[PDB]
Amino acid sequence: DKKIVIMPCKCAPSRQLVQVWLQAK
Amino acid sequence: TLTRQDLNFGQVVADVLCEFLEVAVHLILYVREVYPVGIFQARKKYNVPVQMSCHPELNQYIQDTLHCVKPLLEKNDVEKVVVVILDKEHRPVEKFVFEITQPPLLSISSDSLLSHVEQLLAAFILKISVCDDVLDHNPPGCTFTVLVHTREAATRNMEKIQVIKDFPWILADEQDVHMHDPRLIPLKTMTSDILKMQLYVEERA
């Protein structure tokens, strides 16, 4: 008997987004 | 008789678990290299080392997610909180499963969570900190998401989109829920008076 399993519709920030932030300082 | 409702109606355990899950998620993201190492700074929690992101939007995303999980824990509507690692094709590669049980009656004979919270939770953190030595290597470019397995019985007359605390959530699809007969790697299990929690990893076979 299945239960509701949910996830956010929105992604976490991408790896590249975070890479740009880090490289910028 | 001591009951789950006696601890502020489930709020104590929900607050302790969301504090823990935040730290555990950050540490997973570090050790599995979901994000570049440079964003993580060394801190302490539960008197043990932890690695926490300083990226504002990542941080806020994780807090926002847990903001939505908190009421579900308070209503005793959570069986699992899962950190799902997805490859560049968006397929699950690995899952960190936090299996949570909150019985209505406190277990009498078990250790007090609240008197021993640091030691008890630290154990999980230490296992995560060294888990790279038992797991396979993820392919390059993975991302993460969070799946919450509820206690609510499903009922096919149901809207995919579910809004919680103003954030849209979705019923999880086959592309995430399904792994091809995964390998299960146990990390840590705890049974305390208030809370039973198991952490294990599912790895794609």
PDB file of N, CA and C in Angstrom, chain B residues 52-154:
ATOM      1  N   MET B  52      30.510  22.843   6.755  1.00  0.00           N
ATOM      2  CA  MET B  52      29.287  23.566   6.429  1.00  0.00           C
ATOM      3  C   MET B  52      29.483  24.589   5.340  1.00  0.00           C
ATOM      4  N   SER B  53      28.628  24.594   4.367  1.00  0.00           N
ATOM      5  CA  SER B  53      28.641  25.538   3.265  1.00  0.00           C
ATOM      6  C   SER B  53      28.465  26.946   3.768  1.00  0.00           C
ATOM      7  N   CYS B  54      29.188  27.833   3.056  1.00  0.00           N
ATOM      8  CA  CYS B  54      29.007  29.279   3.256  1.00  0.00           C
ATOM      9  C   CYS B  54      28.324  29.902   2.034  1.00  0.00           C
ATOM     10  N   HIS B  55      27.812  29.120   1.094  1.00  0.00           N
ATOM     11  CA  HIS B  55      27.150  29.635  -0.093  1.00  0.00           C
ATOM     12  C   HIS B  55      25.741  30.060   0.320  1.00  0.00           C
ATOM     13  N   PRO B  56      25.330  31.337   0.182  1.00  0.00           N
ATOM     14  CA  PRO B  56      24.055  31.729   0.750  1.00  0.00           C
ATOM     15  C   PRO B  56      22.836  31.058   0.165  1.00  0.00           C
ATOM     16  N   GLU B  57      22.797  30.928  -1.108  1.00  0.00           N
ATOM     17  CA  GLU B  57      21.567  30.374  -1.725  1.00  0.00           C
ATOM     18  C   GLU B  57      21.503  28.863  -1.480  1.00  0.00           C
ATOM     19  N   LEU B  58      22.620  28.159  -1.455  1.00  0.00           N
ATOM     20  CA  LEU B  58      22.600  26.710  -1.101  1.00  0.00           C
ATOM     21  C   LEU B  58      22.121  26.543   0.330  1.00  0.00           C
ATOM     22  N   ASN B  59      22.646  27.383   1.188  1.00  0.00           N
ATOM     23  CA  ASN B  59      22.243  27.301   2.559  1.00  0.00           C
ATOM     24  C   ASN B  59      20.766  27.508   2.763  1.00  0.00           C
ATOM     25  N   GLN B  60      20.252  28.551   2.077  1.00  0.00           N
ATOM     26  CA  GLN B  60      18.848  28.893   2.194  1.00  0.00           C
ATOM     27  C   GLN B  60      17.963  27.798   1.583  1.00  0.00           C
ATOM     28  N   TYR B  61      18.408  27.158   0.526  1.00  0.00           N
ATOM     29  CA  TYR B  61      17.652  26.089  -0.090  1.00  0.00           C
ATOM     30  C   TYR B  61      17.480  24.930   0.888  1.00  0.00           C
ATOM     31  N   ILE B  62      18.602  24.555   1.549  1.00  0.00           N
ATOM     32  CA  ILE B  62      18.573  23.469   2.518  1.00  0.00           C
ATOM     33  C   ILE B  62      17.663  23.855   3.712  1.00  0.00           C
ATOM     34  N   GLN B  63      17.778  25.094   4.208  1.00  0.00           N
ATOM     35  CA  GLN B  63      16.897  25.524   5.297  1.00  0.00           C
ATOM     36  C   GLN B  63      15.428  25.520   4.836  1.00  0.00           C
ATOM     37  N   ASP B  64      15.156  26.006   3.658  1.00  0.00           N
ATOM     38  CA  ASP B  64      13.774  26.069   3.144  1.00  0.00           C
ATOM     39  C   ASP B  64      13.175  24.674   3.038  1.00  0.00           C
ATOM     40  N   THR B  65      13.983  23.732   2.515  1.00  0.00           N
ATOM     41  CA  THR B  65      13.558  22.341   2.450  1.00  0.00           C
ATOM     42  C   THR B  65      13.208  21.779   3.826  1.00  0.00           C
ATOM     43  N   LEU B  66      14.082  22.034   4.784  1.00  0.00           N
ATOM     44  CA  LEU B  66      13.863  21.519   6.147  1.00  0.00           C
ATOM     45  C   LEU B  66      12.705  22.221   6.801  1.00  0.00           C
ATOM     46  N   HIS B  67      12.442  23.480   6.467  1.00  0.00           N
ATOM     47  CA  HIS B  67      11.269  24.266   6.948  1.00  0.00           C
ATOM     48  C   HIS B  67      10.004  23.540   6.583  1.00  0.00           C
ATOM     49  N   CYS B  68      10.017  22.875   5.411  1.00  0.00           N
ATOM     50  CA  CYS B  68       8.859  22.112   4.932  1.00  0.00           C
ATOM     51  C   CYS B  68       8.810  20.735   5.592  1.00  0.00           C
ATOM     52  N   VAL B  69       9.936  20.134   5.883  1.00  0.00           N
ATOM     53  CA  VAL B  69       9.988  18.842   6.532  1.00  0.00           C
ATOM     54  C   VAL B  69       9.488  18.979   7.983  1.00  0.00           C
ATOM     55  N   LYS B  70       9.775  20.079   8.663  1.00  0.00           N
ATOM     56  CA  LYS B  70       9.514  20.225  10.121  1.00  0.00           C
ATOM     57  C   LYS B  70       8.073  19.933  10.434  1.00  0.00           C
ATOM     58  N   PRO B  71       7.062  20.540   9.819  1.00  0.00           N
ATOM     59  CA  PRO B  71       5.672  20.204  10.144  1.00  0.00           C
ATOM     60  C   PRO B  71       5.308  18.790   9.887  1.00  0.00           C
ATOM     61  N   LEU B  72       5.885  18.182   8.880  1.00  0.00           N
ATOM     62  CA  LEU B  72       5.626  16.773   8.595  1.00  0.00           C
ATOM     63  C   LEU B  72       6.129  15.905   9.691  1.00  0.00           C
ATOM     64  N   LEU B  73       7.293  16.218  10.256  1.00  0.00           N
ATOM     65  CA  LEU B  73       7.809  15.483  11.444  1.00  0.00           C
ATOM     66  C   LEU B  73       6.885  15.741  12.605  1.00  0.00           C
ATOM     67  N   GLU B  74       6.445  16.950  12.824  1.00  0.00           N
ATOM     68  CA  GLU B  74       5.627  17.263  14.024  1.00  0.00           C
ATOM     69  C   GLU B  74       4.339  16.516  13.968  1.00  0.00           C
ATOM     70  N   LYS B  75       3.768  16.227  12.845  1.00  0.00           N
ATOM     71  CA  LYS B  75       2.536  15.478  12.731  1.00  0.00           C
ATOM     72  C   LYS B  75       2.750  14.003  12.575  1.00  0.00           C
ATOM     73  N   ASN B  76       3.995  13.584  12.789  1.00  0.00           N
ATOM     74  CA  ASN B  76       4.393  12.207  12.673  1.00  0.00           C
ATOM     75  C   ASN B  76       4.019  11.645  11.338  1.00  0.00           C
ATOM     76  N   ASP B  77       4.485  12.320  10.267  1.00  0.00           N
ATOM     77  CA  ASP B  77       4.150  11.990   8.943  1.00  0.00           C
ATOM     78  C   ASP B  77       5.370  11.752   8.063  1.00  0.00           C
ATOM     79  N   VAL B  78       6.456  11.293   8.678  1.00  0.00           N
ATOM     80  CA  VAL B  78       7.704  11.039   7.966  1.00  0.00           C
ATOM     81  C   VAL B  78       8.217   9.638   8.282  1.00  0.00           C
ATOM     82  N   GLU B  79       8.431   8.817   7.300  1.00  0.00           N
ATOM     83  CA  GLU B  79       9.170   7.557   7.487  1.00  0.00           C
ATOM     84  C   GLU B  79      10.642   7.690   7.078  1.00  0.00           C
ATOM     85  N   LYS B  80      10.912   8.445   6.013  1.00  0.00           N
ATOM     86  CA  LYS B  80      12.290   8.634   5.539  1.00  0.00           C
ATOM     87  C   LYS B  80      12.517  10.015   5.047  1.00  0.00           C
ATOM     88  N   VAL B  81      13.691  10.542   5.290  1.00  0.00           N
ATOM     89  CA  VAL B  81      14.205  11.723   4.600  1.00  0.00           C
ATOM     90  C   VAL B  81      15.408  11.206   3.831  1.00  0.00           C
ATOM     91  N   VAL B  82      15.466  11.411   2.519  1.00  0.00           N
ATOM     92  CA  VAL B  82      16.494  10.806   1.663  1.00  0.00           C
ATOM     93  C   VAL B  82      17.205  11.897   0.924  1.00  0.00           C
ATOM     94  N   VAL B  83      18.534  11.939   1.001  1.00  0.00           N
ATOM     95  CA  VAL B  83      19.351  12.761   0.122  1.00  0.00           C
ATOM     96  C   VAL B  83      19.707  11.917  -1.111  1.00  0.00           C
ATOM     97  N   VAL B  84      19.170  12.299  -2.268  1.00  0.00           N
ATOM     98  CA  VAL B  84      19.324  11.562  -3.502  1.00  0.00           C
ATOM     99  C   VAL B  84      20.351  12.269  -4.339  1.00  0.00           C
ATOM    100  N   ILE B  85      21.360  11.531  -4.718  1.00  0.00           N
ATOM    101  CA  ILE B  85      22.389  11.991  -5.634  1.00  0.00           C
ATOM    102  C   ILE B  85      22.113  11.550  -7.029  1.00  0.00           C
ATOM    103  N   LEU B  86      22.012  12.467  -7.960  1.00  0.00           N
ATOM    104  CA  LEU B  86      21.623  12.236  -9.350  1.00  0.00           C
ATOM    105  C   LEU B  86      22.787  12.468 -10.280  1.00  0.00           C
ATOM    106  N   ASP B  87      22.980  11.584 -11.264  1.00  0.00           N
ATOM    107  CA  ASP B  87      24.039  11.807 -12.246  1.00  0.00           C
ATOM    108  C   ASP B  87      23.683  12.880 -13.262  1.00  0.00           C
ATOM    109  N   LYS B  88      24.586  13.133 -14.222  1.00  0.00           N
ATOM    110  CA  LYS B  88      24.333  14.188 -15.207  1.00  0.00           C
ATOM    111  C   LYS B  88      23.118  13.926 -16.084  1.00  0.00           C
ATOM    112  N   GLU B  89      22.650  12.705 -16.223  1.00  0.00           N
ATOM    113  CA  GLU B  89      21.439  12.318 -16.904  1.00  0.00           C
ATOM    114  C   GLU B  89      20.207  12.348 -15.978  1.00  0.00           C
ATOM    115  N   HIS B  90      20.437  12.841 -14.723  1.00  0.00           N
ATOM    116  CA  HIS B  90      19.410  12.971 -13.726  1.00  0.00           C
ATOM    117  C   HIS B  90      18.902  11.664 -13.152  1.00  0.00           C
ATOM    118  N   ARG B  91      19.725  10.631 -13.246  1.00  0.00           N
ATOM    119  CA  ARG B  91      19.352   9.324 -12.720  1.00  0.00           C
ATOM    120  C   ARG B  91      19.967   9.162 -11.323  1.00  0.00           C
ATOM    121  N   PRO B  92      19.239   8.516 -10.427  1.00  0.00           N
ATOM    122  CA  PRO B  92      19.793   8.298  -9.136  1.00  0.00           C
ATOM    123  C   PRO B  92      20.978   7.389  -9.195  1.00  0.00           C
ATOM    124  N   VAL B  93      22.034   7.802  -8.544  1.00  0.00           N
ATOM    125  CA  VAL B  93      23.272   7.029  -8.350  1.00  0.00           C
ATOM    126  C   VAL B  93      23.468   6.519  -6.995  1.00  0.00           C
ATOM    127  N   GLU B  94      22.996   7.265  -5.954  1.00  0.00           N
ATOM    128  CA  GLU B  94      23.195   6.938  -4.600  1.00  0.00           C
ATOM    129  C   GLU B  94      22.175   7.708  -3.724  1.00  0.00           C
ATOM    130  N   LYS B  95      21.822   7.112  -2.626  1.00  0.00           N
ATOM    131  CA  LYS B  95      20.800   7.693  -1.742  1.00  0.00           C
ATOM    132  C   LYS B  95      21.241   7.543  -0.366  1.00  0.00           C
ATOM    133  N   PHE B  96      21.209   8.618   0.445  1.00  0.00           N
ATOM    134  CA  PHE B  96      21.480   8.587   1.873  1.00  0.00           C
ATOM    135  C   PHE B  96      20.102   8.600   2.527  1.00  0.00           C
ATOM    136  N   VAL B  97      19.763   7.479   3.129  1.00  0.00           N
ATOM    137  CA  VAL B  97      18.399   7.266   3.685  1.00  0.00           C
ATOM    138  C   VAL B  97      18.419   7.433   5.156  1.00  0.00           C
ATOM    139  N   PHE B  98      17.691   8.433   5.692  1.00  0.00           N
ATOM    140  CA  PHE B  98      17.483   8.656   7.115  1.00  0.00           C
ATOM    141  C   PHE B  98      16.099   8.113   7.432  1.00  0.00           C
ATOM    142  N   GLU B  99      16.020   6.915   7.940  1.00  0.00           N
ATOM    143  CA  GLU B  99      14.744   6.218   8.267  1.00  0.00           C
ATOM    144  C   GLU B  99      14.371   6.544   9.682  1.00  0.00           C
ATOM    145  N   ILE B 100      13.221   7.136   9.940  1.00  0.00           N
ATOM    146  CA  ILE B 100      12.834   7.811  11.215  1.00  0.00           C
ATOM    147  C   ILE B 100      11.539   7.175  11.670  1.00  0.00           C
ATOM    148  N   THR B 101      11.474   6.759  12.933  1.00  0.00           N
ATOM    149  CA  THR B 101      10.255   6.253  13.535  1.00  0.00           C
ATOM    150  C   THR B 101      10.088   6.973  14.869  1.00  0.00           C
ATOM    151  N   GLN B 102       8.886   7.492  15.115  1.00  0.00           N
ATOM    152  CA  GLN B 102       8.493   8.213  16.315  1.00  0.00           C
ATOM    153  C   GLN B 102       7.266   7.525  16.912  1.00  0.00           C
ATOM    154  N   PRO B 103       7.501   6.534  17.752  1.00  0.00           N
ATOM    155  CA  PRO B 103       6.342   5.827  18.333  1.00  0.00           C
ATOM    156  C   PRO B 103       5.541   6.705  19.235  1.00  0.00           C
ATOM    157  N   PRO B 104       4.254   6.396  19.436  1.00  0.00           N
ATOM    158  CA  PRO B 104       3.433   7.239  20.301  1.00  0.00           C
ATOM    159  C   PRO B 104       3.773   7.154  21.782  1.00  0.00           C
ATOM    160  N   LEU B 105       4.375   6.066  22.195  1.00  0.00           N
ATOM    161  CA  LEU B 105       4.831   5.839  23.519  1.00  0.00           C
ATOM    162  C   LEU B 105       6.350   5.912  23.565  1.00  0.00           C
ATOM    163  N   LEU B 106       6.893   6.514  24.608  1.00  0.00           N
ATOM    164  CA  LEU B 106       8.339   6.513  24.710  1.00  0.00           C
ATOM    165  C   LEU B 106       8.735   5.063  25.095  1.00  0.00           C
ATOM    166  N   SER B 107       9.885   4.617  24.563  1.00  0.00           N
ATOM    167  CA  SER B 107      10.492   3.345  24.954  1.00  0.00           C
ATOM    168  C   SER B 107      11.310   3.625  26.218  1.00  0.00           C
ATOM    169  N   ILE B 108      10.604   3.521  27.316  1.00  0.00           N
ATOM    170  CA  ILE B 108      11.050   3.045  28.622  1.00  0.00           C
ATOM    171  C   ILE B 108      12.551   2.674  28.808  1.00  0.00           C
ATOM    172  N   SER B 109      12.958   1.579  28.199  1.00  0.00           N
ATOM    173  CA  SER B 109      14.247   0.955  28.457  1.00  0.00           C
ATOM    174  C   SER B 109      15.390   1.517  27.595  1.00  0.00           C
ATOM    175  N   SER B 110      15.069   2.381  26.637  1.00  0.00           N
ATOM    176  CA  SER B 110      16.098   2.900  25.730  1.00  0.00           C
ATOM    177  C   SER B 110      16.771   4.125  26.333  1.00  0.00           C
ATOM    178  N   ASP B 111      17.975   4.448  25.839  1.00  0.00           N
ATOM    179  CA  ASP B 111      18.732   5.631  26.224  1.00  0.00           C
ATOM    180  C   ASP B 111      17.884   6.908  26.002  1.00  0.00           C
ATOM    181  N   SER B 112      18.031   7.859  26.888  1.00  0.00           N
ATOM    182  CA  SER B 112      17.429   9.166  26.728  1.00  0.00           C
ATOM    183  C   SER B 112      18.087   9.960  25.617  1.00  0.00           C
ATOM    184  N   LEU B 113      17.318  10.256  24.535  1.00  0.00           N
ATOM    185  CA  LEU B 113      17.838  11.101  23.522  1.00  0.00           C
ATOM    186  C   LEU B 113      18.270  12.411  24.090  1.00  0.00           C
ATOM    187  N   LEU B 114      17.387  12.999  24.912  1.00  0.00           N
ATOM    188  CA  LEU B 114      17.698  14.401  25.299  1.00  0.00           C
ATOM    189  C   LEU B 114      18.868  14.597  26.265  1.00  0.00           C
ATOM    190  N   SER B 115      19.144  13.589  27.069  1.00  0.00           N
ATOM    191  CA  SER B 115      20.296  13.617  27.982  1.00  0.00           C
ATOM    192  C   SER B 115      21.587  13.291  27.266  1.00  0.00           C
ATOM    193  N   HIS B 116      21.495  12.642  26.116  1.00  0.00           N
ATOM    194  CA  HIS B 116      22.690  12.175  25.433  1.00  0.00           C
ATOM    195  C   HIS B 116      22.706  12.614  23.945  1.00  0.00           C
ATOM    196  N   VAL B 117      22.121  13.759  23.664  1.00  0.00           N
ATOM    197  CA  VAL B 117      21.889  14.086  22.221  1.00  0.00           C
ATOM    198  C   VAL B 117      23.213  14.222  21.487  1.00  0.00           C
ATOM    199  N   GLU B 118      24.215  14.928  22.038  1.00  0.00           N
ATOM    200  CA  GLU B 118      25.503  15.069  21.351  1.00  0.00           C
ATOM    201  C   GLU B 118      26.114  13.738  21.031  1.00  0.00           C
ATOM    202  N   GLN B 119      26.214  12.816  21.984  1.00  0.00           N
ATOM    203  CA  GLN B 119      26.928  11.591  21.746  1.00  0.00           C
ATOM    204  C   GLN B 119      26.182  10.737  20.728  1.00  0.00           C
ATOM    205  N   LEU B 120      24.823  10.698  20.844  1.00  0.00           N
ATOM    206  CA  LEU B 120      24.069   9.894  20.027  1.00  0.00           C
ATOM    207  C   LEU B 120      24.115  10.348  18.541  1.00  0.00           C
ATOM    208  N   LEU B 121      23.988  11.661  18.371  1.00  0.00           N
ATOM    209  CA  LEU B 121      23.953  12.185  16.982  1.00  0.00           C
ATOM    210  C   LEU B 121      25.361  12.281  16.380  1.00  0.00           C
ATOM    211  N   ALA B 122      26.355  12.542  17.236  1.00  0.00           N
ATOM    212  CA  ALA B 122      27.730  12.584  16.784  1.00  0.00           C
ATOM    213  C   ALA B 122      28.086  11.297  16.059  1.00  0.00           C
ATOM    214  N   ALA B 123      27.554  10.178  16.547  1.00  0.00           N
ATOM    215  CA  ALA B 123      27.903   8.914  15.909  1.00  0.00           C
ATOM    216  C   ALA B 123      27.587   8.843  14.484  1.00  0.00           C
ATOM    217  N   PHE B 124      26.408   9.417  14.116  1.00  0.00           N
ATOM    218  CA  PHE B 124      25.995   9.467  12.737  1.00  0.00           C
ATOM    219  C   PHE B 124      26.931  10.394  11.910  1.00  0.00           C
ATOM    220  N   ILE B 125      27.210  11.549  12.453  1.00  0.00           N
ATOM    221  CA  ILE B 125      28.096  12.517  11.806  1.00  0.00           C
ATOM    222  C   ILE B 125      29.479  11.854  11.504  1.00  0.00           C
ATOM    223  N   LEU B 126      30.042  11.227  12.539  1.00  0.00           N
ATOM    224  CA  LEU B 126      31.376  10.547  12.295  1.00  0.00           C
ATOM    225  C   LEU B 126      31.268   9.534  11.218  1.00  0.00           C
ATOM    226  N   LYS B 127      30.223   8.769  11.094  1.00  0.00           N
ATOM    227  CA  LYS B 127      30.142   7.802  10.007  1.00  0.00           C
ATOM    228  C   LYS B 127      30.096   8.491   8.647  1.00  0.00           C
ATOM    229  N   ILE B 128      29.293   9.569   8.560  1.00  0.00           N
ATOM    230  CA  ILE B 128      29.227  10.277   7.310  1.00  0.00           C
ATOM    231  C   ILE B 128      30.620  10.824   6.923  1.00  0.00           C
ATOM    232  N   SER B 129      31.331  11.326   7.916  1.00  0.00           N
ATOM    233  CA  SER B 129      32.634  11.998   7.643  1.00  0.00           C
ATOM    234  C   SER B 129      33.647  11.094   6.976  1.00  0.00           C
ATOM    235  N   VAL B 130      33.494   9.779   7.180  1.00  0.00           N
ATOM    236  CA  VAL B 130      34.392   8.767   6.583  1.00  0.00           C
ATOM    237  C   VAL B 130      33.737   7.848   5.599  1.00  0.00           C
ATOM    238  N   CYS B 131      32.476   8.112   5.188  1.00  0.00           N
ATOM    239  CA  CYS B 131      31.790   7.161   4.301  1.00  0.00           C
ATOM    240  C   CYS B 131      32.375   6.996   2.933  1.00  0.00           C
ATOM    241  N   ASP B 132      33.186   7.963   2.459  1.00  0.00           N
ATOM    242  CA  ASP B 132      33.773   7.822   1.126  1.00  0.00           C
ATOM    243  C   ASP B 132      34.574   6.535   1.012  1.00  0.00           C
ATOM    244  N   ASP B 133      35.044   6.021   2.145  1.00  0.00           N
ATOM    245  CA  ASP B 133      35.835   4.760   2.142  1.00  0.00           C
ATOM    246  C   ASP B 133      35.061   3.492   2.022  1.00  0.00           C
ATOM    247  N   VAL B 134      33.762   3.601   1.935  1.00  0.00           N
ATOM    248  CA  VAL B 134      32.913   2.372   1.664  1.00  0.00           C
ATOM    249  C   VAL B 134      32.050   2.494   0.466  1.00  0.00           C
ATOM    250  N   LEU B 135      31.961   3.690  -0.120  1.00  0.00           N
ATOM    251  CA  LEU B 135      31.111   3.890  -1.263  1.00  0.00           C
ATOM    252  C   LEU B 135      31.876   3.836  -2.578  1.00  0.00           C
ATOM    253  N   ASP B 136      31.184   3.558  -3.640  1.00  0.00           N
ATOM    254  CA  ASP B 136      31.677   3.707  -4.999  1.00  0.00           C
ATOM    255  C   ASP B 136      31.963   5.169  -5.326  1.00  0.00           C
ATOM    256  N   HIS B 137      32.584   5.433  -6.455  1.00  0.00           N
ATOM    257  CA  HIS B 137      32.899   6.802  -6.805  1.00  0.00           C
ATOM    258  C   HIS B 137      31.736   7.241  -7.655  1.00  0.00           C
ATOM    259  N   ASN B 138      31.083   8.357  -7.327  1.00  0.00           N
ATOM    260  CA  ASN B 138      30.066   8.930  -8.181  1.00  0.00           C
ATOM    261  C   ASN B 138      30.657   9.383  -9.490  1.00  0.00           C
ATOM    262  N   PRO B 139      29.862   9.283 -10.575  1.00  0.00           N
ATOM    263  CA  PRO B 139      30.315   9.923 -11.777  1.00  0.00           C
ATOM    264  C   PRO B 139      30.433  11.442 -11.637  1.00  0.00           C
ATOM    265  N   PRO B 140      31.172  12.087 -12.527  1.00  0.00           N
ATOM    266  CA  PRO B 140      31.267  13.510 -12.471  1.00  0.00           C
ATOM    267  C   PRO B 140      29.953  14.250 -12.654  1.00  0.00           C
ATOM    268  N   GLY B 141      29.827  15.410 -12.012  1.00  0.00           N
ATOM    269  CA  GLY B 141      28.742  16.285 -12.306  1.00  0.00           C
ATOM    270  C   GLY B 141      27.385  15.938 -11.649  1.00  0.00           C
ATOM    271  N   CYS B 142      27.464  15.229 -10.551  1.00  0.00           N
ATOM    272  CA  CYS B 142      26.167  14.866  -9.908  1.00  0.00           C
ATOM    273  C   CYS B 142      25.503  16.108  -9.253  1.00  0.00           C
ATOM    274  N   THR B 143      24.208  16.001  -9.030  1.00  0.00           N
ATOM    275  CA  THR B 143      23.427  17.027  -8.282  1.00  0.00           C
ATOM    276  C   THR B 143      22.746  16.295  -7.142  1.00  0.00           C
ATOM    277  N   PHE B 144      22.062  16.998  -6.272  1.00  0.00           N
ATOM    278  CA  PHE B 144      21.232  16.366  -5.238  1.00  0.00           C
ATOM    279  C   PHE B 144      19.868  16.937  -5.209  1.00  0.00           C
ATOM    280  N   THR B 145      18.971  16.118  -4.610  1.00  0.00           N
ATOM    281  CA  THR B 145      17.646  16.514  -4.208  1.00  0.00           C
ATOM    282  C   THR B 145      17.288  15.796  -2.934  1.00  0.00           C
ATOM    283  N   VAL B 146      16.128  16.074  -2.424  1.00  0.00           N
ATOM    284  CA  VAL B 146      15.633  15.511  -1.128  1.00  0.00           C
ATOM    285  C   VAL B 146      14.294  14.901  -1.348  1.00  0.00           C
ATOM    286  N   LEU B 147      14.121  13.625  -1.023  1.00  0.00           N
ATOM    287  CA  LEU B 147      12.832  12.922  -1.066  1.00  0.00           C
ATOM    288  C   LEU B 147      12.353  12.678   0.343  1.00  0.00           C
ATOM    289  N   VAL B 148      11.090  12.971   0.610  1.00  0.00           N
ATOM    290  CA  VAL B 148      10.444  12.711   1.875  1.00  0.00           C
ATOM    291  C   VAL B 148       9.429  11.632   1.649  1.00  0.00           C
ATOM    292  N   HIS B 149       9.629  10.498   2.337  1.00  0.00           N
ATOM    293  CA  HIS B 149       8.642   9.433   2.305  1.00  0.00           C
ATOM    294  C   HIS B 149       7.723   9.582   3.480  1.00  0.00           C
ATOM    295  N   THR B 150       6.442   9.824   3.215  1.00  0.00           N
ATOM    296  CA  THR B 150       5.501  10.173   4.263  1.00  0.00           C
ATOM    297  C   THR B 150       4.838   8.879   4.770  1.00  0.00           C
ATOM    298  N   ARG B 151       4.003   9.103   5.807  1.00  0.00           N
ATOM    299  CA  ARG B 151       3.114   8.023   6.306  1.00  0.00           C
ATOM    300  C   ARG B 151       1.737   8.057   5.697  1.00  0.00           C
ATOM    301  N   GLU B 152       1.469   9.004   4.790  1.00  0.00           N
ATOM    302  CA  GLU B 152       0.143   9.193   4.292  1.00  0.00           C
ATOM    303  C   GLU B 152       0.014   8.246   3.295  1.00  0.00           C
ATOM    304  N   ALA B 153      -1.138   7.588   3.552  1.00  0.00           N
ATOM    305  CA  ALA B 153      -1.559   6.680   2.500  1.00  0.00           C
ATOM    306  C   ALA B 153      -1.852   7.463   1.229  1.00  0.00           C
ATOM    307  N   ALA B 154      -1.357   6.946   0.155  1.00  0.00           N
ATOM    308  CA  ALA B 154      -1.646   7.544  -1.181  1.00  0.00           C
ATOM    309  C   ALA B 154      -3.122   7.223  -1.600  1.00  0.00           C
TER     310      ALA B 154
END
